[PDB]
Design a protein around this nucleic acid. Sequence first.
RNA 1: UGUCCCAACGUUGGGCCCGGUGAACUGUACAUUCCAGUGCGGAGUCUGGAGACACCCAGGGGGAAGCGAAGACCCUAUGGA
RNA 2: CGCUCUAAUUGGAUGGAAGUAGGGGUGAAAACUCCUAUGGACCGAUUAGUGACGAAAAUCCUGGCCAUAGUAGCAGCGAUA
RNA 3: ACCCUCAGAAGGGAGGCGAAAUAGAGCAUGAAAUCAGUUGGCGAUCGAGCGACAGGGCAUACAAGGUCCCUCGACGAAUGACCGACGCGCGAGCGUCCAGUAAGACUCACGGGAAGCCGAUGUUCUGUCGUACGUUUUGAAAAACGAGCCAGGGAGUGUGUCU
Lengths: 142, 142, 150, 49
Amino acid sequence: TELQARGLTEKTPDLSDEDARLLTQRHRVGKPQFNRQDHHKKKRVSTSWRKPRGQLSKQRRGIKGKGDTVEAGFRSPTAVRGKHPSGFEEVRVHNVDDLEGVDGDTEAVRIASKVGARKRERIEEEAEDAGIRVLNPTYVEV
Amino acid sequence: AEFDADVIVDARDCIMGRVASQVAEQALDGETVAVVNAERAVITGREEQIVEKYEKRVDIGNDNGYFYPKRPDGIFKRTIRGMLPHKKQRGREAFESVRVYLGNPYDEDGEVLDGTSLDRLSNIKFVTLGEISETLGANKTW
Amino acid sequence: GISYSVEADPDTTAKAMLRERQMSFKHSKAIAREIKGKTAGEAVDYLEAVIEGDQPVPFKQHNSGVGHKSKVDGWDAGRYPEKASKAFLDLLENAVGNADHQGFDGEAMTIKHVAAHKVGEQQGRKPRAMGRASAWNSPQVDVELILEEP
Amino acid sequence: YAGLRTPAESFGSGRGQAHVPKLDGRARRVPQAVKGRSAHPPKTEKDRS
RNA sequence: UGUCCCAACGUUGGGCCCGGUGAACUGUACAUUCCAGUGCGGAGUCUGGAGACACCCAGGGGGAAGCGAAGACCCUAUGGA
RNA sequence: CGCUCUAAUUGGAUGGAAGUAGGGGUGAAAACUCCUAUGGACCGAUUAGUGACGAAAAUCCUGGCCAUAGUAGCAGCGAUA
RNA sequence: ACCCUCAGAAGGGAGGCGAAAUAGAGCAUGAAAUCAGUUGGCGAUCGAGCGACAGGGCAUACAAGGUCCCUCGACGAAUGACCGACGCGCGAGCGUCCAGUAAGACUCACGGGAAGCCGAUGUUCUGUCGUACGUUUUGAAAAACGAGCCAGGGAGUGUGUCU
Ligand SMILES: [Cl-]
Ligand SMILES: [Cl-]
Ligand SMILES: [Cl-]
Ligand SMILES: [Cl-]
Ligand SMILES: [Cl-]
Ligand SMILES: [Cl-]
Ligand SMILES: [Cl-]
Ligand SMILES: [Mg+2]
Ligand SMILES: [Mg+2]
Ligand SMILES: [Mg+2]
Ligand SMILES: [Mg+2]
Ligand SMILES: [Mg+2]
Ligand SMILES: [Mg+2]
Ligand SMILES: [Mg+2]
Ligand SMILES: [Mg+2]
Ligand SMILES: [Mg+2]
Ligand SMILES: [Mg+2]
Ligand SMILES: [Mg+2]
Ligand SMILES: [Mg+2]
Ligand SMILES: [Mg+2]
Ligand SMILES: [Mg+2]
Ligand SMILES: [Mg+2]
Ligand SMILES: [Mg+2]
Ligand code: NA
Ligand code: NA
Ligand code: NA
Ligand code: NA
Ligand code: NA
Ligand code: NA
Ligand code: NA
Ligand code: NA
Ligand code: NA
Ligand code: NA
Ligand code: NA
Ligand code: NA
Ligand code: NA
Ligand code: NA
Ligand code: NA
Ligand code: NA
């Protein structure tokens, strides 16, 4: 009578003490929006990032208040870079075969959006039997 | 009429600036202040020059205006306004919770703040706000 | 053209629309604005008073250079848009018509919703001096109306 | 000759218009003009072997 | 002899209000400013103060170094006629 | 990093592709991805190629559109109707 | 189609077809600029590169993020005391000891708590910094030049030879 997500939605990866520290760091520190300079001043100018090139650009010159310039110093910790917030490493999956070789302790799985309902149900059920959590589960009424 | 002043300060024979400075400090700390006997507060210097300064202020102006008070009432208050960011929300609040009066409309005799009292016995070159106001053309309503 | 921008319960609701009327889109906004919440009956009386010149239509957005009207309350500028008003009286006649043929008491129904939309312009061209020409167009208006039982 | 088949000319300064060759009040020939030539297009002469 | 002293009154069409019709110029953004200062030495936007409740109608045009025209002057181009 | 089309290898889609709107996650970032709605037929990945391959600008071009504005004009003419 | 309305072969209402009419005629999809109505936030005593980073208010269906808060305790870099005891200094105050102690960012464990609640998103308030962008220029916020806004279009290519 209510909606229930298929699979091991609650499943949690196990991570070394270090990795969990680093993942918790990344989540604490965060990073700036790194949006394009002045995108908020002109509609035609999109948020996507482009390096400010104006010889006079206040951002390009690093004037406090004009936004942070993309630098390598902003990168995330090697050990965690790319992990889903849960700590799981994602694996893009299109069919049942793709499920083979996936560590349900370490990796969770994300079903390509294109995969239709029919093939989903198959993937979702065998994914769970293999101890793998599906990040984008189908919600059925039970 | 009726002003729940947490502090009632007496300006009689006290150095306006020094008092005003301390009143702003408190009003910014949230205190509701009321200054008493403004007509009797004093400012050191050579009367002649002092008056010139103020007369000039009265004369300065134009369409946009430069409203400067002539009553020892206003005078004292504008002085305090100069010691507060009266245009910032916090500063208008503090300034507004401060009021100056001619004489003392309370029952309690106000208090004399440290280092704002002037010794008439060892000081001859000074002026009374009221003397100033009479010179400005104010109406002696006190 | 438009489509009803609001959901209406058929059991307690009457509808009506005007299609591509060539009239001031600015007047319509004001008119709609003014008669919403009124009784279809009240609305008719009002718009006829406007047409008559006894009741002014508050102009709150498109008021540049409009002269103040004593009768406007809470505001100042206003006019008597008789053309637009007449087209609204057609809209109303139709809505109250449909409402009766459905068993309701048309006139007593509340104007739950009324909005004007500029659907286009019948384009025109005006010769100007120096051998050049400039636009001389006509707005085309659409307007939705939804009647609701009190 | 795609886009070059026109006698379009630019009016030059004077009418608060960019110097773009026009004809019958329509911009033409130049690459940044709709219906204008393609700046650096594919070429038959190129050796694709 | 209203050119002037020195302006007045009047006439007609406008102007103003209402119905109908219905453009153009112009627009980086923000924008209630004023006095000063500063700055590429001619600032509504910086700095300091002052002033400033919102909207609307009419006006004569002080300012936006107002709008209009890639300066005719002047110089430069191994330019043109 | 991203775009077009070619090839090899290998996948998705009417149990709903592309696109679009709003929304969640990743990447320092170019950008990648997921969810819901819409849509109703196509769409990818990896590798090696391909090139009329990336825009905020050029008094840029073309189209559309907002303010301007319910504003100017619909009075002036020796034919005031 | 039929019926009602209308000056009406208009239009509108009700209805019918179809998987769909938000496929109804320049009718696939249907972006942005933008318009109407409307919801959330702000709002008629107040200041202007429109933001960035911090932190508050208010607002939020599900989904795709799930964290967050307080007691206490563990760990604890640089830094690092109050009080008190003694001894200096005209004085403000300093020295020795108590002590590299208490404290000390992050992180964690037990217990307790939150589901608009944490993140995130919308808007608004406060703090810090902040006079666009690109170009010309020794020097541009510039009273130097360009653009009304948006979408789409818009600029190192080919052959020959040389290196
Ligand atoms: Cl890197
Ligand atoms: Cl004045
Ligand atoms: Cl202030
Ligand atoms: Cl003395
Ligand atoms: Cl319009
Ligand atoms: Cl840590
Ligand atoms: Cl190049
Ligand atoms: Mg933008
Ligand atoms: Mg007027
Ligand atoms: Mg002619
Ligand atoms: Mg062409
Ligand atoms: Mg100022
Ligand atoms: Mg020139
Ligand atoms: Mg000459
Ligand atoms: Mg010659
Ligand atoms: Mg392969
Ligand atoms: Mg154009
Ligand atoms: Mg005007
Ligand atoms: Mg006559
Ligand atoms: Mg269509
Ligand atoms: Mg108020
Ligand atoms: Mg110079
Ligand atoms: Mg493009
Ligand atoms: Na003094
Ligand atoms: Na004055
Ligand atoms: Na208005
Ligand atoms: Na009234
Ligand atoms: Na009124
Ligand atoms: Na031709
Ligand atoms: Na132009
Ligand atoms: Na060839
Ligand atoms: Na005369
Ligand atoms: Na002027
Ligand atoms: Na907020
Ligand atoms: Na330039
Ligand atoms: Na610039
Ligand atoms: Na300047
Ligand atoms: Na224009
Ligand atoms: Na190109």
